[PDB]
Structure formats: C-alpha cells, structure tokens
Write a protein that binds this DNA or RNA. Structure first.
Ligand SMILES: [Cl-]
Ligand SMILES: [Cl-]
Ligand SMILES: [Cl-]
Ligand SMILES: [Cl-]
Ligand SMILES: [Mn+2]
Ligand SMILES: [Mn+2]
Ligand SMILES: [Mn+2]
Ligand SMILES: [Mn+2]
Ligand SMILES: [Mn+2]
Ligand SMILES: [Mn+2]
Ligand SMILES: [Mn+2]
Ligand SMILES: [Mn+2]
Ligand SMILES: [Mn+2]
Ligand SMILES: [Mn+2]
Lengths: 94, 99, 85, 108, 92, 104, 77, 97
DNA sequence: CAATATCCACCTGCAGATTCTACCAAAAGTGTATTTGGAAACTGCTCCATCAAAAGGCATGTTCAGCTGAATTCAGCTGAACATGCCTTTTGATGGAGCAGTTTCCAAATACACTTTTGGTAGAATCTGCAGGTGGATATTGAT
DNA sequence: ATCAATATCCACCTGCAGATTCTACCAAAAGTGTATTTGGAAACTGCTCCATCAAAAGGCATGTTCAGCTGAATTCAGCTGAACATGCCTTTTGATGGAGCAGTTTCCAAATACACTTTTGGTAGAATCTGCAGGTGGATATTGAT
C-alpha cells in the first residue's frame, strides 16, 4: 500500500565500489536522491528541447549526448560522454 | 584581570565556529510561527507538514548566509569591515533581487 | 492556531541574525542590519510560501507538504536537496 | 525463452536502465524514446553519482568518519570546481558552507 | 510555410491603437514574446499537472500557471481575461 | 464558427491547442485550455502594445518600433519584472544618470 | 584579434551604461569578459548547429544558446 | 580658445548614447572576433548573416548591463571611475565568477 | 556678464519599408465512434495540531573602553578634452555555389498487448558508527 | 620579554538511536510475437553565404596639456564587541484526538480517433508612406572674468 521509489539502492551499489567500507546516512542518501533527479530532469529536458528544435519526434542516445555536452561542465562532460557512449555499445552488442 | 578579549577576537572566533558546523542558526519555534503567520495571511487555516517548515528554514538560512557573503564583500569593497544596510542593498540590486 | 499570530518577525532575534552573518563571514555589523535582515527575510519567505501554497491550492489540500516548498524553491531559482528526493 | 537479464546488467551498469527508459516515456520529454537513451542517460547519471561519492568518501575519510553525511557532500561539491559549477544554484540541506574568512578581516 | 503571430498581434494593435502601426523588428519582438510566454505558461502547467499525477493539462492548470508567472496586477487581469473568454466558449 | 470567435478573441485558439498537443507538455489537453491561454496571450499582448503606443506617440511618431517597447517595459514595474531577464534587440536602455555624477 | 574592439567602442558602451570616468586598465578587463561571453554563448551555439548536422550557425542557434545561458533575446525567433 | 571642463562632455556622451539604440561596436571587427572564436569549435563554419546581428545585440546589451552594475560598485566605494575591480565585484556577485 | 560649441523644435522631400490585394497547400472545424481520465464517494491510517510540564539554554539589558567609520586636508598622477593623421570599416553589387531544406521510398527502428519472470520497497530483526561528556595537553591572547 | 587566563584540540569511552541485514509480496522490468513509423539514401533547388573589387569619409590612433580624482595619512566622536546578571522561552518528551491524506469502487463527462469539408494564413506582388537626411535659427547650457 503505497510504493515509494528512489535511487538509494543503486546509489549505494556505487558507493561500495569507490569506498568499499564507507557508509551513507539517511539525510545523505536524501541529498543524493535529489541529485540524480535534478540531473535526470536537467538532461532529459535539455534533450527534449534539442528534439523539438530539430522537428524530430524521438530522443535517441545522440540527443542525450548533446544534452550532456550542453549541460555538463568541461571534464565532467568528457568523462560522462565517454562512460555514456561506452555502456550503449556494450549494450547494443546484444 | 578580569580577562578580556580585544574587539574582533571573538568575532573571528565565532565565524570559525559557525563555519565549521551545519546546524540552523535560528530557533525552530519562532521560525515556525513566523511562517504560519505569513502563510495564515495568504490562505487561512493552512496545515503544515512539519518537514515543510523544516525545508523553508533550511532554504531561508542558506539564503541569508549567502546574502551575508555578498554583503560582506561590498563592505570590504568600500574599505570597510563592518557590513551596513548600504551593502546588503547593493548586493541585492546587483543580484537582481530588487534592482 | 488559537492565539492570533502577530509580530513574529521580531522572533528572529538579533543574536540569531548575528549568527547567520558569522557563518557568512561578516566580522562587524552595523546596528541597522538587523531590521534590514528581517525585511529581506520576510520578503524571501512570503515569496517561497506564496508559490508553495499556490501549489497546495492547486492540489486541493489544506496541508503544505515538503514538496510544495521544494517546488516553490525550484521555480524561485533556489533549488533545495534533502526533502524532495 | 532465454532467462532474462536486466538491460542494465547488459550495459554493465549499476543504474536501472529500465527505470530511466520509463521515466523518459512517462515524462513527456518526447513523442517516443529510443533504445539506448535510457542506457546512455543512466550511464551519465551513474557516472556523476560515483564522482560525487568519490570526493565525498574522502571528505569523510579526512574528518575521520566511516559514514558520509551532507556536510561531506557540501565539502566535495564546493571544493571541486566542476561539481561546484554544475550545482551552483543548488542549496544542500544540513551542509553548511566552506570555511573561509576574508583576509582583510584577520589580525595584524 | 512559416508561422508567426504577426497577424494577430497586429489586429490587436488595432483594438487599442487602431490608427497606429508597428515596425518589422518591433513586430519581431512581439513574436518572441508570445512564444516565450507561451513556453513558460505551458511548462508550469505541464509540471503542475505532472506534480499532481494528472495526465491532462486543462484550464485549471493554465490558470495556476499564470498565477505563478505573472506579477500581482498583471496576473489578476490575465485570469479575468482568461476566465471571461473561456466561460463564453462553453456558453454555446 | 472559429473556436476563437467563440471565446471572442483574435489570437489562434485552435493553433494554441495544436501547439500544446505537439509540444510534449502532457498526455492530453483540456478543451478550454487553449482558450484560457490564447486569451492570456491576447491580454498580455494588448497590455504591452497599448503602452508601446503611448511611448511611440510620445515622440511624435506613429509607427511603433523597438525603443518604444523597451520603454513600455522598463518603465512598467510588472512587465519589467515579468521580462526581468529578457533583452529586447535594438531597444536601448532608459535615460538614467546617477545624481552623484551631475555637475557641481 | 579581440583588439578588434577599439578602446573607443568600449567607451561608447560604458557611456550608455552611464559611466563617466573610466580607468585605463578597464579597456583590457572589458575585452576579457567580452571574450568569455561570446566563447560560452558560441560554444553552446555551434553545438545546436552540429547537432542539427549543419555547417551553418543560424540566428536561432544563437537564440537558443543565449536562452540556456539565461540571456533570452526577443527579435530573432 | 574654448575647451570643455573634464566630465562635462562625458555627460554629453552619456545623455547621447543612452538616447540612441544603435550598436556601438564596429560590426566588421565584431564578426571577425566571432568567426575567429567559432573556429575553436568547428572549422569551415557558415554564419547566418543575422546570427551575427543576434550575437552583437546579445553582447553589447550584456556589456552595458555589466557596466551599470560596475558603476554601482564604483560609486559604492566612494568613487566615479570604473576600475577592473568594480567589474570583478559586479561579476562575482552576479554569479558569473 | 557675454563668447563659444551644443542643442532642440520647425520644416520639407523620396524611398527603403510598410500595408493591402490576389490567390492556394495546410491546418482548423464538423460529425460518429472509441477509450479514458479523474471527479465522486466512502474508510482506515498517518501525520499534524495542540497541550503539559521541567530546566537551562539563550535572549535581553547594561555598562565600558577599543578603533572603526566618517571627516579633512594635500598633490602626484591619472585619464578627459582637443586637435592632427591616416587606416580601415562601411556601402554596392555581382557571381559561383556550398547549402540548408524538400520530397520518394522502406529497412531498421521503436510502438503495443499479453504473459512471464524477477528486481525492489516495506517492515522486522541485529547491529555499530558516533554524538555527547570529561579531562589532560598544547596554542593563543593580552596584560605587565 | 615572560606569565596567567581561556579557548582549541584530541583520545578515550558507551550506550542507542539510526544504519545495515534478513525476508516476503507485487507492481514492473523482460521475453516474445505483431504493429506502425521514424528519419535516413539519394535526387534536386532556389537561397543565401562567402569571396573579391572598388570607393570614401568616418572613425581610430597617437600625442599635448592639466582639471580634479584617487589615494594616502592623520584625528576624534561615537558606534559596537566583549563581558557579565537576570530570568524568559525554546527545547524535549510523549500522550491524544482528529482533521486530512491517500487508497479502493465506478461512472459520466471528456478527450482522442479518423474521415471529409471549409477557410485561413501566408507568400509573393501592388500601391502607399512614416522618417530619416540635411537646413535653419533661436535658445541652451558651458565657462572664462570688471
Ligand atoms: Cl537511441
Ligand atoms: Cl546604510
Ligand atoms: Cl479544460
Ligand atoms: Cl582594479
Ligand atoms: Mn575507490
Ligand atoms: Mn480509469
Ligand atoms: Mn578607518
Ligand atoms: Mn529476489
Ligand atoms: Mn565528539
Ligand atoms: Mn595641479
Ligand atoms: Mn476525518
Ligand atoms: Mn477512428
Ligand atoms: Mn485570409
Ligand atoms: Mn531627422
């Protein structure tokens, strides 16, 4: 009865990879959850516009990529763009 | 002596203290009322989801601590070390908050 | 609320405002900053809230939820993390 | 039928490539959402998450703490030029500000 | 095949100041405006109805939205004008 | 029989309805939505135009151009607020000088 | 090439902004900011060009860029 | 002969340029600065005429804005001459830096 | 007081630009049908709104002496105002064609409608990082 | 140049709130077969955009002076910052109703679908003009002095 979603479960998996023996508080995970969302929306919206701008009707990976580039700052983008282009090929390689 | 610190010693002391911490600096209850009062004035009989009052206070204080910096830089920009309304008014203007 | 809510702005004591300015880096403070703070503060609040309650009325509720504020703050350009995610 | 394996696991991601794809559709951003979009976006999101986490984990390490808290996240962001800029108009609850006293204020 | 509000802005420019004209650039400015405000009001509404698990943007949303983007007095007239104009639609 | 003639407006009520649909705002659009909106657009337009008019005329000029808009805008508190972050191409700034700069 | 912005110009501008007395180091400082402005707004602008798979930065390309920059511009789209 | 006391013409120039709305930076050199800059992003680029117009309107307008805020900062510090310092205080507060 | 320059209404003219005027591929608008919100209405089930002590953290006042902020000279340079001196921006068109935009088709995408397998979220156990608390050192500060 | 008179630091401890772990139910991601619809190949196309070439005043770039501006350096009244008393008022718990909040049925009022008909709205072409673009001629401030 009432199912609340979040990224807490994933945020955590990642935490354990960078710092195997470090923990994160409730309020902290709160902050983190907001983050993924602010950014999720930021990019999605940015991609959305990019598509309307190009009178196209679907968001490909390509759009998400210019969005990230238009949105994210310098080095963060590079890394994001690489990490991004990577996962997809690794995916489309069925 | 009775002992006594020079003017500013404790001031710089506090700054260091309050920058090393993260608690809100305003008393919860008063804030509570101020918000309810103001909200009472927009739409009568409004109930407040605790955390909401908690969020407003987190946003308010974060906001001022921020205005106080830009304020402080305006005081220093005019060879002063004591912030004055004059200063807050210039930061607000330049910020666009009021122009 | 029973007892009529009045003059609660002066409930932002001088010591508290001074505290906020310390975390702010301010060393010395003119005596007229205080009332000046309440003035700025009150406006900030009236705004965040005014929009917040709008969201509350749109959803047809008698309660101002944490999200209502989080949304208010967002459109105000003061995005806040820690309550709406 | 072949035993399912979450799209995420295929992309070797820790982030829910399926949950992002949905959010994209139920979000109205576009008339239709591609197939790698949720994989890409998830990749970017998961990336950034880890970055914050890295700097944060250290911020806690420094302070002699095993458990991260908002303070540490404020510290991470405000000290990393980039994360700072990405989240420049963002205020973080219970996080405080960076310790910093203007030099003209200090003693003789 | 190139849309704009160039026509309407003008017909309107004629209700208030019938005997007055408008530049080309000035007319350009006026477009950017409608589109801009169109954009904002739609977005808030969209968000509004989205925050409220609603799958349809109505007039109620467009209203709140207005009541969020426009300044005191500006907001008042918009809403009147909007309500007015709408009530008339429904009424046959 | 134009939805606009019904709401008694000038702006394209139908079009605004189309632009909403094909804008990726929501799943479906109410019937009086484009109505309510177009009249807001109708409103805000007239409001500005009216003021640019005066502005235009105030210079013994009949055709409204940029400088007049930038005048009806930055001179009006609400419009200036609303367009608080918009720059009007070829509009200039308001004649204004800090008294602290005037002669002896 | 930035010097293309002659000392006079930078003054004509300052004057429209109501400046009376101008320091001399300002002119340099003003070419600094300006340079950054265009860079940031064109860096974004060309991205809309390139996403649109085109070889021409269009007036709208600037218009959008300028928008996300928060410098909305009425009069070009 | 005749010579205007300093500051009197400056005023003349303010009152004048504020009244007009035409651009102040010479177009040709602007366009080059732009074209040149664009080069660091993509080679053999084509700039839609007007996009250049847009670019300048965008810039000049931005600058004048900054100058006002700058002037406020110079005035605030009891002065009347804008120093690179006021330009920084202004920007530092706008959030630009 | 008047000499200089700077300016501001009073005036006519052509044309670089409005405005209409004249027709047509696209949406608007019109049923008739089809599918669907989300506005009713009831129910628990949470949170929210008080309230009622205890104390003891903190405000509020009240000195009291330190040094900021505000005032006031001086003059060593900035930068404005003004002329000369050319060097480029700034109009004027013309080619030549690199290019944004348009269609025809269609293989390769994403849509859907069920039907199956899980990957999470909600709670209920077990923990186990630290807030407090206390107390010996440094580490400053500010009188003599 | 030393000594008190206070913070400012850091190491231990030690219960418990808050964090993991440990399970069970489901809305949801997959795994299939069909359904439909992108947007790219390429085949053209006027449209601007990019070069040159040729002009001219129109700005832009140096030099001269020095008019006041911006910075020092002193002062001094007077506005705080730094300390106590005094004793409100804000925490901190922690029980208790009950507004509301959210699920959990359906049930019309509406919104979406597709299929034709009817009109605009928009894109060049035809008549108009609102304002530059110069030209004067009183004034309008600047500014140097019996
Ligand atoms: Cl894709
Ligand atoms: Cl003041
Ligand atoms: Cl509706
Ligand atoms: Cl400087
Ligand atoms: Mn690691
Ligand atoms: Mn239903
Ligand atoms: Mn001083
Ligand atoms: Mn399982
Ligand atoms: Mn401790
Ligand atoms: Mn001298
Ligand atoms: Mn009830
Ligand atoms: Mn059908
Ligand atoms: Mn027609
Ligand atoms: Mn003229």
């Amino acid at each position: 009865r009432s199912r609340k979603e979040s990224y807490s479960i994933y945020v955590y998996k990642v935490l354990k990879q960078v710092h195997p023996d470090t923990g994160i508080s409730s309020k902290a995970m709160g902050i983190m959850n907001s983050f993924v969302n602010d950014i999720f929306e930021r990019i999605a919206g940015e991609a959305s516009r990019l598509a309307h701008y190009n009178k196209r009707s679907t968001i490909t990976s390509r759009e998400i990529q210019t969005a990230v580039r238009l949105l994210l700052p310098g080095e963060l983008a590079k890394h994001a763009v690489s990490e991004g282009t990577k996962a997809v090929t690794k995916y489309t390689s069925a | 002596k009775p002992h006594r610190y020079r003017p500013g010693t404790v001031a710089l002391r506090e700054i260091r203290r309050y920058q090393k911490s993260t608690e809100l600096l305003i008393r919860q209850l008063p804030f509570q009322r101020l918000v309810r009062e103001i909200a009472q004035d927009f739409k009568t009989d409004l109930r407040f989801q605790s955390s909401a009052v908690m969020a407003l206070q987190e946003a308010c204080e974060a906001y001022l601590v921020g205005l106080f910096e830009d304020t402080n830089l305006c005081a220093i920009h005019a060879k002063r070390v004591t912030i004055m309304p004059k200063d807050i008014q210039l930061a607000r203007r330049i910020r666009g908050e009021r122009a | 609320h029973r007892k009529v809510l009045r003059d609660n702005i002066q409930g932002i004591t001088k010591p508290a405002i001074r505290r906020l300015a310390r975390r702010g880096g301010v060393k010395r403070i003119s005596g007229l900053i205080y009332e000046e703070t309440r003035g700025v503060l009150k406006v900030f609040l009236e705004n965040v809230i005014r929009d917040a309650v709008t969201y509350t009325e749109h959803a047809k509720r008698k309660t101002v939820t944490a999200m209502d504020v989080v949304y208010a703050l967002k459109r105000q350009g003061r995005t806040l993390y820690g309550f709406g995610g | 039928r072949a035993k399912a394996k979450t799209r995420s696991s295929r992309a070797g991601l820790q982030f829910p490539v399926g949950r992002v794809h949905r959010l994209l559709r139920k979000g109205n951003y576009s008339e239709r959402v591609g197939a790698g979009a949720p994989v890409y976006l998830a990749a970017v999101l998961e990336y950034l998450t880890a970055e914050i986490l890295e700097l944060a984990g250290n911020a806690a390490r420094d302070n002699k703490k095993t458990r991260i808290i908002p303070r540490h996240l404020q510290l991470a962001i405000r000290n990393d030029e980039e994360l700072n800029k990405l989240l420049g108009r963002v205020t973080i609850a219970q996080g405080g500000v960076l310790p910093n006293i203007q030099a003209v204020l200090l003693p003789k």
